[PDB]
Curated annotation (Swiss-Prot), chain B:
Ranges of the ANK repeats in the UniProt entry: 14-44, 53-81, 82-102, 109-138
Name of the protein in its database record: Short transient receptor potential channel 5
Tissue: Expressed in brain with higher levels in fetal brain. Found in cerebellum and occipital pole.
Quaternary structure and partners: Homotetramer. Heterotetramer with TRPC1 and/or TRPC4. Each subunit in the homomeric ion channel (via ANK repeats) interacts with one copy of GTP-bound GNAI3; the interaction is direct and activates the ion channel. Interacts with TRPC4AP. Interacts with NHERF1. Interacts with MX1 and RNF24. Interacts (via C-terminus) with CABP1. Interacts with SESTD1 (via the spectrin 1 repeat). Interacts with PLSCR1. Interacts with PKD2L2.
Family: Belongs to the transient receptor (TC 1.A.4) family. STrpC subfamily. TRPC5 sub-subfamily.
Recorded disease: Loss-of-function variants in TRPC5 may be involved in a mental disorder characterized by maladaptive behavior, anxiety, autism, postpartum depression, extreme food-seeking and hoarding behavior, hyperphagia and obesity.
Function: Forms a receptor-activated non-selective calcium permeant cation channel. Mediates calcium-dependent phosphatidylserine externalization and apoptosis in neurons via its association with PLSCR1. Acts on distinct neuronal populations in the hypothalamus to regulate innate behaviors including feeding, anxiety (flight/fight/fear), socialization, and maternal care.
Shown residues within the full chain: 17 to 221 of 973
Compartment(s) of residence: Cell membrane
Binding site for Zn(2+): 140, 144, 146, 149
Species annotation: Homo sapiens (Human)
Domain of life (superkingdom): Eukaryota
Amino acid sequence: RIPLQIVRAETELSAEEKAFLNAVEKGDYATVKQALQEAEIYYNVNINCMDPLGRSALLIAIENENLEIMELLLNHSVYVGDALLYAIRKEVVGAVELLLSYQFSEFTPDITPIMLAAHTNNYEIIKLLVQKRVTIPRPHQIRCNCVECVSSSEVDSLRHSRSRLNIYKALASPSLIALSSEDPILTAFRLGWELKELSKVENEFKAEYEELSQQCKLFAKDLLDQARSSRELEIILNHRDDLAKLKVAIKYHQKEFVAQPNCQQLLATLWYDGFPGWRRKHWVVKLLTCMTIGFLFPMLSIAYLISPRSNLGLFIKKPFIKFICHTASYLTFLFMLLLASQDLHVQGPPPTVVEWMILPWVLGFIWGEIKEMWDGGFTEYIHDWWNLMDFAMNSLYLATISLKIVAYVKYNGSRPREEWEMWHPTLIAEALFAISNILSSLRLISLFTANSHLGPLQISLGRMLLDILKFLFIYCLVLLAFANGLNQLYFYYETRAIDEPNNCKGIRCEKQNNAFSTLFETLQSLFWSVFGLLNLYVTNVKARHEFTEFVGATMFGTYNVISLVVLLNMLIAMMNNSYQLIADHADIEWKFARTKLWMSYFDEGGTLPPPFNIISLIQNQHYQEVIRNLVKRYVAAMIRNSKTHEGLTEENFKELKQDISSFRY
Amino acid sequence: RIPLQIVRAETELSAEEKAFLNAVEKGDYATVKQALQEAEIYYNVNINCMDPLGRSALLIAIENENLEIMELLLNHSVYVGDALLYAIRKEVVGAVELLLSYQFSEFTPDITPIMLAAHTNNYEIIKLLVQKRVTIPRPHQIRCNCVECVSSSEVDSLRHSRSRLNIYKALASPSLIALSSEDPILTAF
Amino acid sequence: NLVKRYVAAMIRNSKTHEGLTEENFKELKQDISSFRY
Ligand SMILES: CC(C)CCC[C@@H](C)[C@H]1CC[C@H]2[C@@H]3CC=C4C[C@@H](OC(=O)CCC(=O)O)CC[C@]4(C)[C@H]3CC[C@]12C
Ligand SMILES: [Ca+2]
Ligand SMILES: [Zn+2]
Ligand SMILES: [Zn+2]
């Protein structure tokens, strides 16, 4: 039999001090007033009593929303501590104003009235509080090591983290940004960037910072949405302190802001400068004009080089024409590379005509690469992740040219490749040239972002590469373990290449042998076993060691099972789970990428294609006026969205009943 | 210490012109009438004042849905601009009829009362508006290259696109197809 | 202390819903009717 009792006992009640609490709970004004005045005359009661549910007279008045009992209690000199915070958090303007005009608490001691107003995001009460000179502390830099920060973290770290989070949550309020801010858009950009940076540093508190950054981005997008004229749109997008604001938004990774329909329409208008009917055109005529502009790229380049100011001179300044010319030049370079492969008995031959034509394009590519790193900088150069492939290709081409010139200078004989050594400079140069051709042909993937059908697909594939890289580590660990074991088992029976039928050793021969004799060969065999290109008799020895053969076969079968049946199927499940979430924002990511690609062609520098490449207060006032108009529209819209819900409004009957009762009285 | 202040400051208030706004907000008919007549006799108040939340006397009457204060304010010769649109968009038939019988705006300048009625898709108010001879502009063919279309797109393209979208959204209303159409099925197709 | 805070928070979460509270008009109507009587 479980003796149910009270373990933590509170104080007793049911005196006159509880009588007048329950009178206030009833709320009848006359009875409350008479009981309170009688108790005050008697001078034997207090006002510190607490109900079992955790509410007092003032808290119950807060919950019931009765201004008459509110003013009566406040004029009766009841306790006032935290009552302003409770009223602000209850979100009633009349009692907030009344309390402003004049133990156990569910409020953190660091909470300020302005902080709570910012947390609750109420425009009216926020303005009412901010009309007085109220301020907010500064949280220190992200990696501050100053004595004040180290000391405060040492005395109490949980309170410090909570205070920082509360300060940032109050600062990231859309209303508190609408007021007391000269540039709300820039403020939102910087705040979102700072919160995104803070999320990584504060590992335990990540979701809160991420949601604050998302809220800032959404506020910026909603503020942009209210523009209702092309003049206002261009003023906003061109304000600086062209398209400086758009460049800043691209830098700060504001994909929702960038992918706005109005901004995209303006960008398309700027992009299709030469053609004004490109929107209303047939696919056949678009294709025909595409070839007819791409075919005359050398003529256009020569015309611009000769006469920069002419009818044909300025025809290449348009971004679309420049993009078409660059694409045609790259396609011509790739065609030359393909034609190159279509006497081989000389040692270090002079370059042929195809290589002579290929060299100016390669030199131009390198020149264009260095200028962009000099103009952009190291961080911008490495952020693209395509410049890595560009640098690798250019370095490989430079090494190929150097090796070819070295071979030409050194060797001058005529000997067969069957007698040439394995480390010949000519052979090294051909291998590097083949790798360079592979990389250059693979470089064409970056042009898929300009298309409507392939951009999101390419963006989705790029996102999944990360999961591929993550699984590669586990696969490599398993492969290393099994290769170590197999080599340790099989390294005893190594045989020389002379004893083999065709003087061939390894797995790249018809007589596959010595598959696990060395660690490198074991790694190669275990890699090739995934695709089923390794035979089954490689796990055999010339001697009759049936136990050893069976153990090796068991190891091989276990590795095959683990690699193919379990790990490969698990990768597939991860790809599906990742792509399900990836497919949601494909449009936004593709539009951001296409905007970056489009703006990459707006600059005046580098107009020519690679082969020929080698050879101020009025604006502030206008922006302020437009920002004021947008803020007013946004405030109205968000007030309405707050009014969209709770459609079953009340107290209209109470107000009318009070009025008619007074008239009857 | 972050100095919180006001960056964009509006006009001041709390005069008799704000007194009678908050009287209208209270909505007591006798008090509103006596205050309004006293202010009219004094001849020192206006009716153009705006609350901090973006509402006026007529807008608050729209939101509160009080026909008596509505007719009192309208017979007191308050400003009437856009009030018909606000009433139609609030979707109250009594005040829509009363307003039909007789700055900062959250409505696009191209919005027409019939267009807003079609957007909101209210059969009764749509019929009440369409009983009068009201019409709708034609958007041009899909690939129109005519001078009027090219010129209007050149002066302002965002407004042109918005106007086209609003016209088509008004035209694609199921109620506006049920009325004023001989073959609703073919029209919908 | 933790129990008190948790009880307050869960009472509030119970009060978070049913925001369209009633019987306030009934109590006021009963009071004014008695005063009129
Ligand atoms: C996977 C292939 C290439 C074989 C490599 C074998 C070892 C060199 C690897 C396999 C697992 C690795 C470990 C995996 C994870 C960790 C935890 C890691 O912990 C942290 O990074 C702690 C700090 C933090 O992340 O907050 C430190 C390295 C260590 C021990 C790694 C050390 C290197 C190990 C032993
Ligand atoms: Ca590049
Ligand atoms: Zn510090
Ligand atoms: Zn036209």
